[PDB]
Write a protein that binds this ligand. Structure first.
Ligand SMILES: *CC(=O)N1CCC(CNc2nc(NC)nc(Nc3cccc4cnccc34)n2)CC1
Ligand SMILES: [Zn+2]
Length: 313
């Protein structure tokens, strides 16, 4: 019996010393086993593996507690999706573009890059520690684990076409938006005024218009009477708001928003690009960067910084 010493983990923080038999596979000794995302379940240990750290599935109480506190789940389906995704996103390149971490294009990841650039420009705290840790390193330039975790938490695989707003809505449900609140009024001339309150993710996202300013002044929506009603923002308490609308030509002005999602395509497929407002307007497309003092293009999401707003209507 020849052996080597290795470490197993589920969180990459608590390391557990193991002795492994070099005549058996990792699968025979640990169950499913991953080396930096690469599935080594069906391979035998090699001399170079001494002292290396391997991911295993939560198969005992120590590992179950560690995975539960780190990912907020012990389901072996999750860690497998995460490792499968990580085996690809560790080979993506993550260039700094206009001071933000982007992703060089690969595996249809334009939507992922647009969402990653967006997460770096809005105040947000994730509840699962795995998400918050990988978030910090994603800001620092090493976003392989963040992107793999996003794909895993949203039940998305590498290469699949994706939607930025669906992605953001998933990630928001894993963030601490408990304090967020929105109060809206809907006015009809022949029916009266109705107030509704929303909390959490619903207080932070709206579908139907891109302009925060128009949201505050009022938007027309069909009413129950068959006439047309006016809906407007009464009160907002959130670190940011996300206005979305079906892709359409929109004029973005410097200094009036935080960032935005460009979308050229149809309802099945399109190209996602990222507009950000710094000292001027910038468009980021993977590793590509252009600027313009004026912008008129197809926008589908606009992000605004917010703290507390109260109407004067
Ligand atoms: C930037 C990015 O990641 N991005 C833009 C290019 C597309 C191309 N890939 C792709 N994959 C699939 N899979 C089914 N389908 C399409 N469809 C498509 C592309 C372009 C035009 C039209 C027009 N009508 C229908 C479909 C398409 N494209 C990947 C995502
Ligand atoms: Zn009415």
């Amino acid at each position: 019996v020849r052996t080597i010493k290795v470490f197993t983990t589920v969180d990459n923080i608590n390391l557990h010393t193991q002795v492994v038999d070099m005549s058996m596979t990792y699968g025979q000794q640990f169950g499913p086993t991953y080396l930096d995302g690469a599935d080594v379940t069906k391979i035998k240990p090699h001399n170079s593996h001494e002292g290396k750290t391997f991911y295993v599935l939560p198969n005992d109480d120590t590992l179950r507690v560690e995975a539960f506190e780190y990912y907020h789940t012990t389901d072996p389906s999750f860690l497998g999706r995460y490792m499968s995704a990580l085996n690809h996103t560790k080979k993506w390149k993550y260039p700094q573009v206009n001071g933000l971490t982007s992703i060089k294009w690969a595996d249809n990841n334009c939507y992922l890059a647009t969402a990653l650039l967006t997460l770096q420009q809005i105040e947000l705290k994730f509840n699962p520690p795995a998400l918050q840790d990988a978030y910090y390193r994603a800001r620092a330039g090493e976003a392989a684990n963040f992107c793999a975790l996003i794909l895993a938490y949203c039940n998305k695989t590498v290469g699949e076409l994706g939607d930025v707003r669906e992605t953001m809505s998933y990630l928001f449900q894993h963030a601490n938006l408990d304090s967020c609140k929105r109060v809206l009024n809907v006015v009809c001339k022949t029916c009266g005024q109705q107030q509704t309150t929303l909390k959490g993710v619903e207080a932070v996202m709206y579908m139907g218009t891109l302009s925060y300013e128009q949201f505050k002044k009022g938007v027309q929506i069909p009413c129950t009477c068959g006439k047309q009603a006016t809906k407007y923002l009464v009160q907002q308490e959130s670190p940011f708001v996300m206005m979305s609308a079906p892709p359409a030509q929109y004029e973005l002005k410097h200094g009036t928003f935080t960032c935005a999602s460009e979308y050229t395509g149809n309802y099945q497929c399109g190209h996602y690009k990222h507009i950000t407002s710094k000292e001027t307007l910038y468009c980021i497309d993977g590793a590509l960067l252009t600027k313009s003092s004026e912008y008129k293009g197809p926008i589908t999401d606009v992000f605004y910084k917010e703290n507390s707003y109260t109407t004067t209507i």
